[PDB]
Design a protein around this ligand. Structure first.
Ligand SMILES: CC(=O)O[C@H]1C(=O)[C@@]2(C)[C@H]([C@H](OC(=O)c3ccccc3)[C@]3(O)C[C@H](OC(=O)[C@H](O)[C@@H](NC(=O)c4ccccc4)c4ccccc4)C(C)=C1C3(C)C)[C@]1(OC(C)=O)CO[C@@H]1C[C@@H]2O
Ligand SMILES: Nc1nc2c(ncn2[C@@H]2O[C@H](COP(=O)(O)OP(=O)(O)OP(=O)(O)O)[C@@H](O)[C@H]2O)c(=O)[nH]1
Ligand SMILES: Nc1ncnc2c1ncn2[C@@H]1O[C@H](COP(=O)(O)OP(=O)(O)NP(=O)(O)O)[C@@H](O)[C@H]1O
Ligand SMILES: Nc1ncnc2c1ncn2[C@@H]1O[C@H](COP(=O)(O)OP(=O)(O)NP(=O)(O)O)[C@@H](O)[C@H]1O
Ligand SMILES: Nc1nc2c(ncn2[C@@H]2O[C@H](COP(=O)(O)OP(=O)(O)O)[C@@H](O)[C@H]2O)c(=O)[nH]1
Ligand SMILES: [Mg+2]
Ligand SMILES: [Mg+2]
Ligand SMILES: [Mg+2]
Lengths: 428, 426, 344, 9, 317
C-alpha cells in the first residue's frame, strides 16, 4: 500500500501536525483514542484490535509543546516513542539545532523513522513539517534531511516550511537561520512547499472575515492544503496523482523546487451561500495574486509548472474549460519553454469541515501548486536583510560560539546568490 | 527541567527576592507553609523550574540567601513567606560590608563565598537540566555589589555554559542613598560586563515615577517597588513554566536581544499598570498594552529611550491573544518610531506569547529593551567617579581592604569603553 | 615624533599533503610576480607571497629578520600566524625546534637576537626575560607553570594591556630559551582531528622583553616582541569534532571571529574598535593598533577542497594590510637625567 | 655587550 | 659618621727547605697573639699568625667581615705586602681548585654566594667581576690580551677607576671559579693583580639600591727599578705623618686603591715574614710597614643610591 511518513520539527511543525492529524482522523472516521466505530493505510497503522497508530514522528528540542500533545485530547493516539523531546531549546540558533544540541536526539529520530519505515511496504516519501527561522526548524531539519538523503535517498522528500514574511516577523536572527537552512537543504529536498504567516493573515482577514487570526486558524488552512495534496493516495477518483508525479511535473530543473501552494475556496458560512462556487470561479480565484499563500505577486514573473488538485464534485470538462480560460488570459504569464504547464488531479472526496472551524462546507475545492519565478523577490529581500545584519556582523558570535565557522555565512550567501541567478536565467 | 538557581545578595536583593517568591508562590498556588492549594494542573506541570520537592507534598524553593549581616535574613525569616525557604540555605556572616565594595569583595565576602558556593553547587547538582542563574542585588551598596560580583565570577568560572541573568538596582541620578555609590557601581559594572549574559537595570527613581504617575500611589514604599520588579522578574521566565503559542527561553531572549557580547544591559518594563478607580475605564487589548509598553514613562530605568535608539526589543505577552494582532502592533510600533530604532537590524522586536495570564489579569506583558540610551546612566556614573577620584575622596576605606588605584582606573576605562561602544551604534 | 607603518602581511602556501593528494584535489593557486597570488581569477596583492617550495630560511629572512633589529633598536615587534586547520602556522612559527633546516620563526629569532646582542657596542647591558602562555577555553594558562590555571589581562598607566602573574624567566644563552620553548610545547594542548593529526587547540603566545641600558650616556631602551601561533578556523564537517574537541573548536572559532572583527574595525576606520571582546584581542591591542611593527604570516592551502577558507584568509590578510600603526621608540627616562632635570 | 641575570635567592 | 681603622695583620710561614739546608735558624719568636718579638724589639700588630696556622683561620679572622660589609653597602679591600717568596700568593689565592687550600678568593666568592642564597628573597642582585693587572705602570686587562696600556678616568664622585676593562656578569659560583682560573692562567711575579667584584643590591619593595665593591688585590716584591712600591711607601709615609699634598698620582698602582688607602672603604692589610736568619735586613722593613699602616684612620659611609623613581619624585617637590 502507498504509505507516507510525517515528520514535525519545531513548534510550528508540531502545531501544524496537530491540526493535520485532527483533520486526518476526522477524514477517516477515527476517534482520537484510536478506535474506529480501508483508505487509511497511507497515514495510519492497524494494530491487532482497533488501535490505529499514525505514521508520525513529533520531534522538538523544547519539551513544552510535545507535552501538550502528550496531555491533550490526542494523548492515546500517538505511540509515546514517536513523541521525542529534548531538554533545552535551540534558542533561535541554527548552530544549536545542527551541531551541538541537534546531535543528541538525531539517532533516536532516525531509529524511529527506520522502525516506521520497516512497517511500510510501499513507502512513497516523507512529509517533513518545519519552519524557516527557528533554531530547531532550521538546524535540526537540515541534519535530519542530510541523514535521510544518505540513508534512503531514492525515496521522495517533501517539505512544508513557514517562510519568513517581508514585514511581519518574530525573531531578530531569522534571516541568518533561513539562509543557512535553505543553503544546506537545497541539495536534499525534492519539493519544498513554502508559506508565510502574513499572506495567510491577509487571506483570513479578507476571505474568512476574521480580524484576529491566530496560529490555530493558520494551521487548519495548512492542514487543508496538505490534505488536498495527499488525498489522491487515500481516496479514489479520476486522474489520481502521486508524489513522484508532483516531482516530475513541478520541478523543471533540479535546483528549482520551491513551489507555493494556494487553496480555494476559503470562505465563511455566511458567504458559503450567495456564491455558486463553480469550478471556473474556484480556479480563477485561485490564480488571483491576493489569494497566494506567499507574499509575492505572481504578476512579477512567469509560471513554469502549475498542478491543480481538484476535490469533490468536479467534472473534467469544467476543468478543461477553466484551464482554457486561464491560458487565454494575458495577465498570467507562462514561460516559453513550457507549452503545457498544467497538471490536473480530480478526486471524489469533498473537503471535510473540522467542528469549531472557520471554513465552510463546500462541495468542491482546489489546491494550486505553482512553480513561478515570483518567489525570487522573497529571496532578494531576505538576502538584503541578511546583508544588512552581516555587514555590521551582528549576532554572529552566538552562531560562531556553537560550532560554526564564520565562512559558512558567506558560503550560504553565495549559494543564495547562485539560486537567484538560476531563477533569473530560467526566467529569460 | 530547565531549572533556575536564585541568589539574593544584600538588603536590596533579599527584600526584592522575598517579594519575588511570594509572587511566584501565589502564581503557582503554594501557600506559605509549602503545601499546594492551586486550581489548575499547569501550576504543578512545571513547578520544578523554581522549586524542589520534599516528603509530604511540600515544595521548597531553590533560593540561596546571602548577606554579611543577619538582620535582613531575620526579617525574611520572620515574614509571611519566610518558612518556605530551606533553613540550610541561609548563609550569612556577622560583620557587614558597611557600604564598602572592597570589604564585600576581598575581605568579608571571601570568607563566606566558599559556603555560598557549596550551597549553590548542591542545589545545581540536585537539578536535572540546569538552565541558568538568577541574582538580585544593588550596585550602590557593599554586600550586594561586591559579594554578588564575586559570586557571579566564581559561578561563571564554574558553569561557563549557563545563562547568568542578574536583576540589579542601579544608582538613581537625582537622589543618592549612599555617598560611595559611584565607586561601588563602577567596580561592580567592571565585572558585570564580563561575567553576565543579560543584566536588567532598575533604578528606584523610575519606580517612584511609575508609582506616582501611572499607579497614582500617594505613599509608595519599598514593597511596591519590589512588587513592580517582581512582576517583570516573573514575566521574563513565564515561557519556562507555562504553555504558550510561541515560547522563548532565557537563552532565546539572549540570542535575540544581544547583538554584541558587551551590550547586554536591558531596560525592563511591565503592562498593564493602572490605578484603582481607573481600571473600569481602560480597555485591555493588545494595542493598549503595546502603547503602555513602549512609553518612556513605563520604563524602570532612568534613561529616556527617546535620547537614543533601540537595538533589540522583546515583548513576552501573556494570556489569550491573536498572533496577528501582536505582530501587526509590533510592526506599526517599529514603523511609527523608525528614528528610535536601529536601521541595520530589521525587525528589532521579538515576540513571545504565553497562554496563561497572571491571576486576576486577562492580559499582561513584559518589555525588555536594549537601548543605546543606557549609556547616559554609565556616563553620569563615570562623571561622578572622576569627580570623586581626582581628589582621592573616600578612597582610603577601599584601599585599606586591599584594593589598588589601578583597579579603579581599569574599571573607569572599562566603563568608558562600554559607553563608547553604545555611542558607536547610535 | 610619529612614523606610521602598515602591517607587513605575507602569504605562505604549503604543499598538498598525503590526505589531500590521494583524494582528487587540484592545485588552484596561480602565482604571478613575486607578491601577488591569483585564485579563481581574482588577484590579491601582499608584501610577499611565498610559493609551495619555500624553505624556512627564506620566510624567516623575508619576514622576521627586520624584527630582531627593530626590537633591539627600541621598537616593539610582533608576528602572529593565521589560517585554517592544517595550513602551516605551527610549521612557520616553531616547526622542528632542534633541526638546523626545519626550524621556525621563534628559534631563528632568538638565535639572531643573541648574535646581534653579541655584535653590539661594549657599553650596553641587556636584560632578557621570556614568557610563554596560551589561551585555552578562554583561559590564559601558563605553559611554564601548571599551577597558574587562569590569569588576567590588566592595564598600565598609559593604557596598554599585559598579562599579570605570568612566569618571567631571565635568559642568558639561546639554550635556556630553547629549553623554555620545549617545556612550553610539552604542556600545550593538542588534539587529533581529521584534517590535522597534531592540531593545536590553543593560542600560544611567546613573549621576550629586551631591556637595554647604556652605561656612558645612561639612555635606556625597552623592546617587547610577541610571537603568537594562533589556532585555525574549523568546520565540523571537515574536522569531525565530537566532545572536548568540539568545545575547543567553539572557543577557537569565537576568538578568531573576534580577531576578524577587530581587524575589520581597524580597516574600515571605525571608532569603537572592539579590542575588549576577547582575551587574544586584548593582549594584541597594541600589536594591531598601537606601538608595534607587526607582520602577519597568513598560511593557506592550495587545494580546491579548501578554496572558501583560502579566500577568507586572503581577504583577512588584504584587509589587515590597510590598517596603520603609530610606532615610537620606547625611551625610558634615566635616573641620572631625572636628577639633572630636578637640579636644573 | 653583556647579558645580565639577576641573582634572586 | 663613623671612623674605622685600616686593620693590619701579620702572617708567618714555616721555614723553607732551602733555609734549613743553608742552616738558617728561627730568630723571630711569638709572644702572645697580638704581637711578635724579633731582634729584641717588640712589634705591635692587630693579630699575628703562627707559622703553622691554617688559612681558614686567617679567612675567618679577616675576610668574613669584608664579605658581609660588601654585601650590605661597604667597599672592602684586602692585600698583602712582603718580601719575595714570603707567601702572598697562598695568602690570597692559595689553591684555586683544591678544597683544602681555598686561600681567600675562592672561599670569599663561595661565601658571598651562600650569603646571597640566604637572607630575604625580595632582593635583586647584579654581581659583576673584573680581573686586571698592571706592570711597569702600564694597566693591562687580564681577561683579554688585546687590551694593553689602559688609563684611569674620573667617575661622578672623586674615585679613580679603570675605564674600558671587561666586566663579566656571574650567576653561579662555578662561573666565578672558572673566570678566576682563566685570569690566573693569563698570568705568566712583579705584577700587581687587581680583582674587583661590584655587588649591586637592589630592593624592590623599598626601591633602594646599594652598591658594594671589594678589592682582592695583590702586590709585588719589596726588595730595595721598582717605583710603584716607592710611591706606595711614600703615600703611607704621607698618611702616617699626616702630611697633606699626598702623592697619590706618582704611580698608577696607588691610583686604583685611593679609596682603599684613605677613602670610603674599610680595608685590612696582611704582611708575610720569614723566621730565617740570613734575611735579617729585609725582614725588618716589612715589619715596620705594618706598624705604620695602622696609623691611618678612614671615614666610611654606606654607598646608597636612589632609584629612578625616587629622583623623579624629588623633582616633583
Ligand atoms: C479586582 C481586580 O481585578 O483587581 C486587580 C486590579 O485592580 C489591578 C489594578 C492590579 C492591582 O495591583 C496593584 O494595585 C499593585 C500594587 C503594588 C504593585 C503593583 C501593582 C492588584 O492589587 C493586584 C492583582 O494582581 C494579581 O492578582 C496578579 O496575580 C499579580 N499578583 C500580585 O502582584 C500579588 C499581590 C499580592 C500578593 C501576591 C501576589 C501578579 C502579577 C504578575 C505576576 C504574578 C502575580 C489584581 C489583578 C488586582 C489587585 C488585587 C487590586 C494591578 O496590578 C497587577 C500586578 O495586576 C495594578 O495595575 C494592575 C491592573 C489590575 O486590574
Ligand atoms: N504557522 C505557524 N507558524 C508558527 C507557529 N509557531 C511559530 N511559527 C513561526 O515559526 C517561527 C519561529 O520558529 P519556531 O518553529 O517557533 O521555533 P522552533 O523551530 O521550535 O525552534 P526553537 O523553539 O528555537 O527550538 C516564526 O516565524 C513563527 O511565526 C505556528 O504554530 N504556526
Ligand atoms: N611548509 C611546509 N612544508 C612541509 N610540510 C608542511 C609545511 N607546512 C606545514 N606542513 C605540514 O603540515 C603539518 C602541520 O600542520 P601545521 O603546519 O602543524 O598546522 P597548524 O597550522 O599548526 N594547524 P592548526 O594548529 O590547527 O592551526 C605538519 O606535519 C607539517 O609537516
Ligand atoms: N702559610 C704557608 N704555608 C705553606 N706554604 C706557604 C705558606 N706561605 C707561603 N708558602 C709557600 O712559600 C712560597 C711563597 O709563596 P708565594 O705565596 O708564592 O710568595 P710571594 O710572597 O707571593 N712571592 P713573590 O710574588 O715572588 O713576591 C710558595 O712556594 C708558597 O707555596
Ligand atoms: N527596592 C528596594 N531597594 C532597597 C532596599 N534596601 C536597600 N535598597 C537600595 O539599595 C541601595 C543600597 O544597597 P544595600 O543593598 O542596602 O547595601 P548592601 O546590603 O551592602 O548590599 C540603595 O540604593 C537603596 O535605596 C529594599 O528593601 N528594597
Ligand atoms: Mg520551540
Ligand atoms: Mg598548530
Ligand atoms: Mg707571589
Amino acid at each position: 500500500m502507498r504509505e507516507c511518513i510525517s515528520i514535525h520539527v519545531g513548534q510550528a511543525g508540531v502545531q501544524i501536525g496537530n491540526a493535520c492529524w485532527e483533520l486526518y482522523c476526522l477524514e477517516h472516521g477515527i476517534q482520537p483514542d484510536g478506535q474506529m466505530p480501508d483508505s487509511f493505510n497511507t497515514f495510519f497503522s492497524e494494530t491487532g484490535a482497533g488501535k490505529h497508530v499514525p505514521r508520525a514522528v513529533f520531534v522538538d528540542l523544547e519539551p513544552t509543546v510535545i507535552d501538550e500533545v502528550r496531555t491533550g485530547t490526542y494523548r492515546q493516539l500517538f505511540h509515546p516513542e514517536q513523541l521525542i523531546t529534548g531538554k533545552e531549546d535551540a534558542a533561535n540558533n541554527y548552530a544549536r539545532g545542527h551541531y551541538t544540541i541537534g546531535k543528541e536526539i538525531i539517532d533516536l529520530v532516525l531509529d524511529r523513522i527506520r522502525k516506521l519505515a520497516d512497517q511500510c511496504t510501499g513507502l512513497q516519501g516523507f512529509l517533513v513539517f518545519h519552519s524557516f527561522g527557528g533554531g530547531t526548524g532550521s538546524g535540526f531539519t537540515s541534519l535530519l534531511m542530510e541523514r535521510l538523503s544518505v540513508d534512503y535517498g531514492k525515496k521522495s522528500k517533501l517539505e512544508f516550511s513557514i517562510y519568513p514574511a517581508p514585514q511581519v516577523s518574530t525573531a531578530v536572527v531569522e534571516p541568518y537561520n533561513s539562509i543557512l537552512t535553505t543553503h544546506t537543504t537545497l541539495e536534499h529536498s525534492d519539493c519544498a512547499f513554502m508559506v508565510d504567516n502574513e499572506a495567510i493573515y491577509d487571506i483570513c482577514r479578507r476571505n474568512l472575515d476574521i480580524e484576529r487570526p491566530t496560529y490555530t486558524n493558520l494551521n487548519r488552512l495548512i492542514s487543508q492544503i496538505v490534505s488536498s495534496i495527499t488525498a489522491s493516495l487515500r481516496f479514489d477518483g479520476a486522474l489520481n496523482v502521486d508524489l513522484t508525479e508532483f516531482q516530475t511535473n513541478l520541478v523543471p530543473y533540479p535546483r528549482i523546487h520551491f513551489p507555493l501552494a494556494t487553496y480555494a475556496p476559503v470562505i465563511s458560512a455566511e458567504k458559503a451561500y450567495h456564491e455558486q462556487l463553480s469550478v471556473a470561479e474556484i480556479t480563477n480565484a485561485c490564480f488571483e495574486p491576493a489569494n497566494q499563500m506567499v507574499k509575492c505577486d505572481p504578476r512579477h514573473g512567469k509560471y513554469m509548472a502549475c498542478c491543480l488538485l481538484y476535490r469533490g464534485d468536479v467534472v473534467p470538462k469544467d476543468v478543461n474549460a477553466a484551464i482554457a480560460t486561464i491560458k487565454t488570459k494575458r495577465s498570467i504569464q507562462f514561460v516559453d519553454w513550457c507549452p503545457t504547464g498544467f497538471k490536473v488531479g480530480i478526486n471524489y472526496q469533498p473537503p471535510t469541515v473540522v467542528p469549531g472551524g472557520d471554513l465552510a462546507k463546500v462541495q468542491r475545492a482546489v489546491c494550486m501548486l505553482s512553480n513561478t519565478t515570483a518567489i525570487a523577490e522573497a529571496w532578494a529581500r531576505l538576502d538584503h536583510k541578511f546583508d544588512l545584519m552581516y555587514a555590521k556582523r551582528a549576532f554572529v558570535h552566538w552562531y560562531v560560539g556553537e560550532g560554526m565557522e564564520e565562512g559558512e555565512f558567506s558560503e550560504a550567501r553565495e549559494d543564495m546568490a547562485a539560486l537567484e541567478k538560476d531563477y533569473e536565467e530560467v526566467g529569460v | 527541567m530547565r531549572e533556575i538557581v536564585h541568589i539574593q545578595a544584600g538588603q536590596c536583593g533579599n527584600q526584592i527576592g522575598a517579594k519575588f517568591w511570594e509572587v511566584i508562590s501565589d502564581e503557582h498556588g503554594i501557600d506559605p507553609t509549602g503545601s499546594y492549594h492551586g486550581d489548575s494542573d499547569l501550576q504543578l506541570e512545571r513547578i520544578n523550574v523554581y522549586y524542589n520537592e520534599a516528603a509530604g507534598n511540600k515544595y521548597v524553593p531553590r533560593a540561596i540567601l546571602v548577606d554579611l549581616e543577619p538582620g535582613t535574613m531575620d526579617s525574611v525569616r520572620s515574614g509571611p513567606f519566610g518558612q518556605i525557604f530551606r533553613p540550610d540555605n541561609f548563609v550569612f556572616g556577622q560583620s557587614g560590608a558597611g557600604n564598602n565594595w572592597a570589604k564585600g569583595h576581598y575581605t568579608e565576602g571571601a570568607e563566606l563565598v566558599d559556603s555560598v558556593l557549596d550551597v549553590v553547587r548542591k542545589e545545581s547538582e540536585s537539578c536535572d537540566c540546569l538552565q541558568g542563574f538568577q541574582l538580585t542585588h544593588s550596585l550602590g551598596g557593599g554586600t550586594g555589589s561586591g559579594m554578588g560580583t564575586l559570586l557571579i565570577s566564581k559561578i561563571r568560572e564554574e558553569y561557563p555554559d549557563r545563562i547568568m541573568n542578574t536583576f540589579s538596582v542601579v544608582p538613581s541620578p537625582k537622589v543618592s542613598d549612599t555617598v560611595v555609590e559611584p565607586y561601588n557601581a563602577t567596580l561592580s559594572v567592571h565585572q558585570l560586563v564580563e561575567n553576565t549574559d543579560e543584566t536588567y537595570c532598575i533604578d528606584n527613581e523610575a519606580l517612584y515615577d511609575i508609582c506616582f504617575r501611572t499607579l497614582k500611589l500617594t505613599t509608595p514604599t519599598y514593597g511596591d517597588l519590589n512588587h513592580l520588579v517582581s512582576a517583570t522578574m516573573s514575566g521574563v521566565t513565564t515561557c519556562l513554566r507555562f504553555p504558550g503559542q510561541l515560547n522563548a527561553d532565557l537563552r532565546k531572549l539572549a540570542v535575540n536581544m544581544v547583538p554584541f557580547p558587551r551590550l547586554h544591559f536591558f531596560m525592563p518594563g511591565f503592562a498593564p499598570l493602572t490605578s484603582r478607580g481607573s481600571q473600569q475605564y481602560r480597555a485591555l487589548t493588545v494595542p493598549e498594552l503595546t502603547q503602555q509598553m513602549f512609553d518612556a514613562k513605563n520604563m524602570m530605568a532612568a534613561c529616556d529611550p527617546r535620547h537614543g535608539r533601540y537595538l533589540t526589543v522583546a515583548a513576552v505577552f501573556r494570556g489569550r491573544m491573536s498572533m496577528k494582532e501582536v505582530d501587526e502592533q509590533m510592526l506599526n510600533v517599529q514603523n511609527k518610531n523608525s528614528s528610535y530604532f536601529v536601521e541595520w537590524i530589521p525587525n528589532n522586536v521579538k515576540t513571545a506569547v504565553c497562554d496563561i495570564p497572571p491571576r486576576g489579569l486577562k492580559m499582561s506583558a513584559t518589555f525588555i529593551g536594549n537601548s543605546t540610551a543606557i549609556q547616559e546612566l554609565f556616563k553620569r556614573i563615570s562623571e561622578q567617579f572622576t569627580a570623586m577620584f581626582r581628589r582621592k575622596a573616600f578612597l582610603h576605606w577601599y584601599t585599606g581592604e586591599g584594593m589598588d588605584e589601578m583597579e579603579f582606573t581599569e574599571a573607569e576605562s572599562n566603563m568608558n569603553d562600554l559607553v563608547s561602544e553604545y555611542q558607536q551604534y547610535q | 615624533d610619529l612614523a606610521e607603518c602598515n602591517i607587513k602581511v605575507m602569504c605562505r602556501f604549503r604543499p598538498l599533503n598525503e590526505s589531500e593528494v590521494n583524494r582528487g584535489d587540484k592545485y588552484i593557486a596561480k602565482f604571478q610576480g613575486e607578491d601577488t597570488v591569483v585564485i579563481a581569477s581574482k588577484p590579491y596583492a601582499f608584501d610577499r607571497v611565498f610559493q609551495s617550495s619555500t624553505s624556512q630560511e627564506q620566510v624567516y629572512n623575508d619576514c622576521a629578520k627586520k624584527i630582531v633589529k627593530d626590537v633591539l633598536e627600541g621598537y616593539n615587534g610582533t608576528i602572529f600566524a593565521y589560517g585554517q586547520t592544517s595550513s602551516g602556522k605551527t610549521h612557520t612559527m616553531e616547526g622542528k625546534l632542534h633541526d638546523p633546516e626545519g626550524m621556525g620563526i621563534i628559534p631563528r629569532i632568538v638565535q639572531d637576537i643573541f648574535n646581534y646582542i653579541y655584535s653590539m657596542d661594549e657599553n650596553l647591558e641587556f636584560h632578557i626575560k621570556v614568557s610563554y602562555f596560551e589561551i585555552y577555553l578562554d583561559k590564559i594558562r601558563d605553559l611554564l607553570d601548571v599551577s597558574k590555571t587562569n590569569l588576567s589581562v590588566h592595564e598600565d598607566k598609559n593604557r596598554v594591556p599585559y598579562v599579570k602573574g605570568c612566569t618571567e624567566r631571565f635568559v642568558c644563552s639561546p639554550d635556556e630559551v630553547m629549553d623554555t620553548i620545549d617545556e612550553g610545547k610539552s604542556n600545550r594542548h593538542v588534539a587529533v582531528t581529521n584534517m590535522n593529526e597534531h592540531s593545536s587547540r590553543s593560542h600560544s603566545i611567546f613573549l621576550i622583553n629586551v631591556k637595554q641600558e647604556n652605561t656612558q650616556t645612561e639612555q635606556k631602551l625597552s623592546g617587547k616582541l610577541y610571537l603568537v601561533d594562533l589556532a585555525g578556523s574549523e568546520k565540523v564537517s571537515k574536522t569531525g569534532a565530537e566532545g572536548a574537541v568540539l568545545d575547543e573548536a567553539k572557543n577557537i572559532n569565537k576568538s578568531l571571529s573576534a580577531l576578524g572583527n577587530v581587524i575589520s574595525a581597524l580597516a574600515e576606520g571605525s571608532t569603537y574598535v572592539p579590542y575588549r571582546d576577547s582575551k587574544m584581542t586584548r593582549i594584541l591591542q597594541d600589536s594591531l593598533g598601537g606601538n608595534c611593527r607587526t607582520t602577519i604570516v597568513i598560511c593557506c592551502s592550495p587545494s580546491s577542497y579548501n578554496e572558501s577558507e583560502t579566500k577568507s584568509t586572503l581577504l583577512f590578510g588584504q584587509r589587515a594590510k590597510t590598517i596603520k600603526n603609530t610606532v615610537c621608540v620606547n625611551v625610558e627616562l634615566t635616573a641620572e637625567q631625572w636628577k639633572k632635570k630636578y637640579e636644573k
